[PDB]
């Protein structure tokens, strides 16, 4: 199963908001099920799909060259394979990632909004940052203090929450393995992590 | 300012663990004591990119111009997160010595580094920035020229 990966063009700086669309029948659908995250901090972000093009066939060349991904069912070994910079003192990266996404955006958006006082944008940003704690060994100081994400205190608290859920850890997550394409960079795009809990 | 904490974190910049050095750089930036400037400049050359980012951030926070020449070098760091942190720090320090290196950084491969360099130039501002922008508008091309034309229309 092949997918396009794209950013929605709304973010002006990292992290960008990412979606996937089935390559078979691509639509610019912003539904929770299509929300994905950057699994590789150091690699390139998927190209934007501008909202001005509501239909894929309306995208003018060369910007319809979106990066193409293969969707795979995630498990610990393959999470570690495609994120070699993963947090090494975590034995089961899969359960940690599953914990983050179970408690993060969008699955847990209501509690994040109510109890941590975030809007969906903040919830999504904080979920991305927490994923990177595990996928890329990013330190709390880089995420909260020195990396330029400009977190407010509610975001910092929500991030701690997500990181604790991951550390303190059925369902799995999809992994989208970058295959080819992407006009912007034509290579070395991020692999993407699904945000939907997949029963198996 | 707690001189005891400053000494403790300065010592921690030599810790074998990169995570400890990150915390140390970050702590020293928050304290703001200029006694940390020479150790943080050394830390700009750390093997670990998160230490270099945090050292750059801390030096931006302290705002001591002793950091300007080493941060200019960090503008061409192999790592884009370090380049961004250096550009942002140079903007915060506000020394005009940084204008021409920041102008070159407008042609960085990473769009967020470019955006950060553009914002740092805006934060420095003044006539050297203005002059550099007109030169760009006339002889430059690409994103740098876009930044310049926008700058001149807004100033």
Q: What is the 3-state secondary structure (H, E, C) of A65-83?
A: CCCEEEEEECCHHHHHHHC
- CATH of segment(s) B71-155: 1.25.10.10
CB contact under 8 A, B30 and A146: no
Instruction: Give SS3 for B87.
Output: helix
Distance CA A57, CA A61 (A): 10
Distance CA B25, CA B50 (A): 10
**Start and end residues for every CATH 1.25.10.10 domain found in chain B:** 1-62, 71-155
Please tell me the distance in Å from A41's CA to the nearest CA on chain B.
10
A13 has a chain B CB within 8 A of its CB: yes
Query: What determination technique applies here?
Result: X-ray
Contact A199, A171 (CB under 8 A): yes
Residues of B in contact with A146 (CB under 8 A): 22, 25-26, 29, 50, 53-54, 56-58, 85
Please tell me the distance in Å from B26's CA to the nearest CA on chain A.
7
A29 has a chain B CB within 8 A of its CB: no
Distance CA B135, CA B28 (A): 39
- B68 Cβ contact list (under 8 Å, min separation 6): B90, B93, B95, B97, B98
Q: Exposed (0-12), middle (13-18) or buried (19+): which is A150, by Cβ within 10 Å?
A: exposed
Residue whose entry in the numeric block shows the structure tokens 């509690």: A111
Please report how many Cα atoms fall inside a 13 Å half-sphere around the Cα of residue B145, on the Cβ side: 6
Domains of chain A, residue spans: 1-83+170-200, 84-169
SS3 percent helix, strand, coil of chain A, rounded to 5, is: 35, 20, 45
Distance CA A162, CA A13 (A): 22
Residue whose entry in the numeric block shows the structure tokens 């999470």: A79
Radius of gyration of chain B (CA): 16
HEC sequence for A134-168:
HHCCCCHHHHHHHCCCCCCHHHHHHHHHHHHHHHC
| Phi, psi torsion values for B47, nearest 5 degrees | -65, -30
A139 has a chain B CB within 8 A of its CB: yes
Distance CA A106, CA A110 (A): 8
| Phi, psi torsion values for A137, nearest 5 degrees | 55, 35
Distance CA A33, CA A20 (A): 9
Distance CA B66, CA A184 (A): 38
CB contact under 8 A, B85 and A138: no
Distance CA A61, CA A48 (A): 13
| The token pair that represents B147 in the structure block | 């930044």
A145 has a chain B CB within 8 A of its CB: yes
Distance CA A5, CA A57 (A): 16
Contact A175, A152 (CB under 8 A): no
Distance CA A44, CA A149 (A): 18
Contact A74, A194 (CB under 8 A): yes
Residues of B in contact with A15 (CB under 8 A): none
| The token pair that represents A137 in the structure block | 């060994």
A90 has a chain B CB within 8 A of its CB: no
Smallest CA–CA distance from A139 into chain B, residue: B19
| Phi, psi torsion values for A55, nearest 5 degrees | -110, 140
Smallest CA–CA distance from A138 into chain B, residue: B50
CB contact under 8 A, A147 and B53: yes
Residue whose entry in the numeric block shows the structure tokens 């006539």: B127
Residue whose entry in the numeric block shows the structure tokens 């501002």: B125
Residues of B in contact with A38 (CB under 8 A): none
Is CATH 3.40.50.1000 what the domain over B1-62 is classified as, yes or no? Answer: no
- A10 Cβ contact list (under 8 Å, min separation 6): A17
Question: In the beta sheet, which residues pair with residue A171?
Answer: A199
CB contact under 8 A, A138 and B50: yes
Distance CA B147, CA A30 (A): 31
- For A2, A21, A135, the CA distances from A30, given in Å and listed in that order, are 18, 10, 25
Radius of gyration of chain A (CA): 16
Q: Which of B3, B36, B9 has its CA nearest to residue B21?
A: B9
Contact A41, A130 (CB under 8 A): no
> CB-CB: which of B19, B26, B116 is closest to A146?
B26
A179 has a chain B CB within 8 A of its CB: no
Among A42, A136, A141, which would you mutate to test the B interface (most chain B Cβ atoms within 10 Å of its Cβ)? A141
Distance CA A84, CA B153 (A): 46
CB contact under 8 A, B50 and A145: no
Widest distance between CA atoms in chain B: 54
Distance CA A48, CA B60 (A): 32
Q: Which of B63, B83, B78, B75 has its CA nearest to residue B100?
A: B75
Q: How many CB atoms lie within 10 A of CB A139?
A: 23
A147 has a chain B CB within 8 A of its CB: yes
């Amino acid at each position: 199963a092949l997918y396009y990966g794209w950013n929605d063009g709304t973010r002006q700086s990292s992290p960008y908001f990412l979606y996937v669309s089935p390559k078979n029948a691509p639509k610019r659908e912003l539904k929770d099920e299509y929300v994905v995250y950057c699994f590789n901090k150091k690699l390139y972000w998927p190209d934007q799909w501008e909202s001005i093009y509501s239909n894929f066939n309306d995208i003018r060349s060369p910007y319809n060259d979106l990066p193409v991904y293969e969707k795979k069912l995630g498990y610990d070994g393959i999470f570690k394979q495609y994120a070699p910079d993963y947090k090494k003192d975590i034995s089961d990266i899969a359960s940690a990632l599953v914990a983050v996404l179970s408690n993060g955006y969008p699955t847990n958006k209501s509690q994040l909004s109510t109890s941590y006082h975030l809007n969906n944008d903040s919830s999504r940003k904080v979920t991305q940052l927490a994923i990177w704690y595990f996928s890329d060994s990013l330190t709390k100081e880089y995420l909260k203090d020195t990396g330029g994400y400009n977190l407010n205190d509610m975001e910092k608290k929500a991030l701690d929450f997500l990181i604790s859920k991951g550390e303190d850890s059925n369902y799995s997550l999809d992994i989208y393995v970058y295959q080819s394409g992407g006009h912007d960079h034509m290579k070395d795009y991020q692999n993407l992590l699904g945000s939907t809990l997949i029963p198996k | 300012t707690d001189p005891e904490k400053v000494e403790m974190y300065i010592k921690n910049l030599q810790d074998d663990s990169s995570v400890v050095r990150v915390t140390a750089a970050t702590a020293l930036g928050k304290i703001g004591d200029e006694r940390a400037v020479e150790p943080l400049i050394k830390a700009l050359k750390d093997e670990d990119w998160q230490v270099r980012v945090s050292a750059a951030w801390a030096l931006g926070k302290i705002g001591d111009e002793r950091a300007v020449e080493p941060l200019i070098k960090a503008l061409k760091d192999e790592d884009s997160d370090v380049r961004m942190a250096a550009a942002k720090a140079l903007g915060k320090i506000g020394d005009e010595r940084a204008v021409e290196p920041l102008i070159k950084a407008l042609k960085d491969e990473d769009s967020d580094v470019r955006r950060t360099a553009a914002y740092a130039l805006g934060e420095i501002g003044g006539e050297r920035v203005r002059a550099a922008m007109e030169k760009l508008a006339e002889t430059g091309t690409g994103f740098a020229r876009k930044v310049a034309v926008n700058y001149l229309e807004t100033h």
